[PDB]
Ligand binder design. Structure first.
Ligand SMILES: CCCCCCCC/C=C\CCCCCCCC(=O)O[C@H](COC(=O)CCCCCCCCCCCCCCC)COP(=O)([O-])OCC[N+](C)(C)C
Ligand SMILES: CCCCCCCC/C=C\CCCCCCCC(=O)O[C@H](COC(=O)CCCCCCCCCCCCCCC)COP(=O)([O-])OCC[N+](C)(C)C
Ligand SMILES: C[N+](C)(C)CCOP(=O)([O-])OP(=O)(O)OC[C@H]1O[C@@H](n2ccc(N)nc2=O)[C@H](O)[C@@H]1O
Ligand SMILES: C[N+](C)(C)CCOP(=O)([O-])OP(=O)(O)OC[C@H]1O[C@@H](n2ccc(N)nc2=O)[C@H](O)[C@@H]1O
Ligand SMILES: [Mg+2]
Ligand SMILES: [Mg+2]
Ligand SMILES: [Mg+2]
Ligand SMILES: [Mg+2]
Lengths: 364, 364
């Protein structure tokens, strides 16, 4: 998976990040207090795995009770989703703090953190689409899922072209707090709160979240793109690895363009009746494409625009070219299974190789 | 176009070939006699350019008088085609002999010879399809053109995996003699000779050429493929450049598969009403893909499966994916023009670079 030179350059890696948000200091104190009361023999990898597992399980339950994102869900699922998201955020902060101390820091923890963040953000966006019932507005339904995907991959892309993580003021913490309070409010008042139209303008309640999302996206995107263009750490404004600045842009453009092209020529409404499966398949694809860039900027190597993850989208595209011999509902499942298996294989292989080199006993 | 290392390895190149055919010795004596009476100040590049120009012009006239390959042509075009083919063969033999003497040998002459052979074989196959009127049998119409293309590219592919040219007994000389005598007979007796059905079996006259073609193809293919597998000159059975043995096979498989895929999903009979344009466009594409391998095995470098020549086939494929917004008769012309321009640009650039390095005054 990783060449000898890349694996050699993996060592002597210094984690560095600068930034702070509005709600950080109080929650920073809270996380410090909670981590003050954690056993010293527990490994951070177990903590992040548990957090990811809880978040994914709760989101999976909510998605299974609400296919197409237009039905309603009981108190059970919403409470479970809110608890899972809060636990995920808490465990992320706590295992970060516990890994910085007790001299357990390693390059593998960063890879686990970023992969878990990718999967968790995909599932959280799916859950927040399912809870609001954003199926009565079919126009604003591709945008939310794939802008969450695009925003996270652009955060990674900003990281690749620079050397330090830069934190904004509308970063992940506020988004997670807003989603948690939204889930709690929807649970306590019922799923029909978003059908309680605002006294004026004839616009429903759901415009209050969506607009904010768009605004946040704009702000976030702005910052990232500036660091892409004005900033450069290599011999010039070029990439830290010496390559071009806009290479992974081709990766994400290809992924999103293929998604849009398959969306627009379904002839059987592939997306509006199977949204969760579609978003999950392309989320696994983009998760692999984002984990590749993580290893790319941890090391100093160069990425290619050819991966064994376009098998799913490739099958969909080549089953759309030929008019219709296989119906477009089994091919989606095959693509999702293939993408999930490929992602799991890649992650396991990389983890095993890094463990073998660094002799760190990944779970210990 | 060519890197410094490749251009350095271009020198110290020794042309070597072994083989002989049945009709060679008499025609060998004839060519020796004719070259005995040629001026000593004339360059071989001019001779091969003149031969290629005459062959292409005569074939173009014949093709223009017979689109779709089902009409008839007068005495004029058939006589001109026979004379042009005979002159092309004579000039090839003569300029080869004249380049071996007068110490004018250079690596550029080989590239000119192979490019001219590619273009000439494409045009000769088009002419022999047009003359026989092989349009009343639409099944056996893709096969002939693309098997000529495939056979020449496989001869080059056999050359790449070895070090010396191997000549068979049913090689190009007999094919050209057969085509010349066929053109002469069709001229003298009229185009309707192939509608003079053989006293038995109810099969028309055209089965006499076609069957032979198939047989010849089989024999030729056999030899080439054996040299591909049993023979190896590198550290192992591997390529002389050290790469895999079956890499250009992907190139030709991609070209022919794309041609077949565009053929089979036309929905407007793109091929059976515009055969000459179709074959010419894909002939230019394969001519560029075959000239690349010529430089590849003259040097010791490695080829890629990514060229700026799939623009035409790419436009056709992506205009077939979207149902139909641009009609499928202008896109073919655009693809043909783009392919021809790209081939001309590549050839001119390579010729100019080699002339600049070797200071040989290409035409002198
Ligand atoms: C049933 C109906 C369909 C029936 C027909 C079956 C078709 C089955 C194959 C489908 C396509 C597979 C493609 C594939 O694997 O190639 C990939 C590129 O894929 C691409 O570049 C994407 C191209 C997709 C189209 C984009 C248009 C915009 C490369 O795959 P690879 O070379 O194998 O991977 C090597 C990867 N390493 C080693 C370099 C890391
Ligand atoms: C009007 C209707 C259509 C409207 C839509 C417009 C579409 C316009 C683009 C059409 C495709 C262009 C592809 C292209 O240039 O890429 C090529 C690969 O092309 C392929 O690999 C072929 C893929 C074709 C599909 C095969 C299926 C089997 C590579 O091109 P490149 O990277 O630019 O070339 C660099 C070449 N060097 C420098 C490496 C030598
Ligand atoms: C901004 N916050 C603090 C609210 C949350 C995001 O912060 P973060 O997760 O990027 O930072 P962190 O505190 O987790 O990072 C501590 C470092 O510990 C390492 N790490 C992470 C996870 C893990 N299981 N083992 C580790 O050793 C990583 O290199 C990580 O960079
Ligand atoms: C088998 N024959 C003899 C019937 C025809 C095919 O033979 P061929 O064209 O491969 O051989 P040839 O006699 O042309 O080759 C002589 C050599 O002269 C060189 N050559 C060719 C053409 C040219 N304009 N200038 C040259 O210097 C090439 O390296 C070529 O290999
Ligand atoms: Mg963390
Ligand atoms: Mg995390
Ligand atoms: Mg010659
Ligand atoms: Mg020749």
């Amino acid at each position: 998976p990783l060449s000898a030179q890349q694996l050699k350059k993996l060592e002597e890696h210094k984690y560095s990040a600068s930034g702070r948000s509005l709600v950080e200091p109080p929650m920073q104190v809270y996380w410090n207090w909670l981590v003050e009361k954690v056993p010293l023999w527990l490994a951070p990898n177990t903590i992040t795995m548990v957090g990811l597992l809880l978040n994914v399980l709760s989101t999976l339950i909510l998605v299974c009770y609400c296919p197409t994102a237009t039905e309603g869900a009981p108190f059970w699922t919403y409470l479970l989703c809110a608890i899972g998201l809060f636990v995920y955020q808490s465990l992320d902060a706590i295992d970060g703090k516990q890994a910085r101390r007790t001299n357990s820091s390693s390059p593998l923890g960063e890879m686990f953190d970023h992969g878990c963040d990718s999967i968790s953000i995909v599932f959280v966006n799916l859950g927040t689409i399912a809870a609001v019932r954003l199926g009565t507005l079919p126009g604003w339904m591709f945008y939310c899922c794939f802008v969450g995907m695009f925003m996270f991959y652009c955060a990674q892309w900003q990281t690749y072209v620079c050397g330090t993580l830069k934190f904004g003021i509308i970063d992940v913490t506020e988004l997670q707090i807003s989603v948690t309070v939204m889930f709690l409010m929807t649970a306590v008042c019922g799923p029909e709160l978003w059908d309680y139209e605002i006294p004026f303008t004839g616009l429903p309640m759901k415009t209050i979240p969506l607009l904010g999302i768009i605004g946040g996206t704009v702000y976030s995107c702005s910052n990232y793109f500036r660091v892409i263009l004005s900033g450069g750490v290599g011999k010039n404004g070029s990439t830290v690895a010496g390559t071009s600045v806009l290479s992974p842009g081709l990766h994400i453009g290809l992924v999103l363009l293929l998604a849009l092209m398959i969306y627009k020529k379904s002839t059987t409404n592939l997306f509006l009746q199977n949204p969760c499966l579609y978003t999950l398949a392309f989320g696994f694809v983009s998760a692999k494409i984002t984990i590749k860039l993580v290893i790319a900027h941890m090391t100093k190597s160069e990425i290619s625009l050819q991966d064994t993850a376009f098998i799913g989208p490739g099958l969909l595209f080549f089953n759309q070219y030929f008019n219709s011999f296989i119906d477009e509902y089994i091919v989606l499942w095959i693509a999702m299974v293939i993408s999930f298996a490929d992602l799991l294989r890649y992650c396991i292989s990389v983890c095993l190789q890094i463990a073998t080199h660094l002799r760190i006993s990944v779970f210990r």
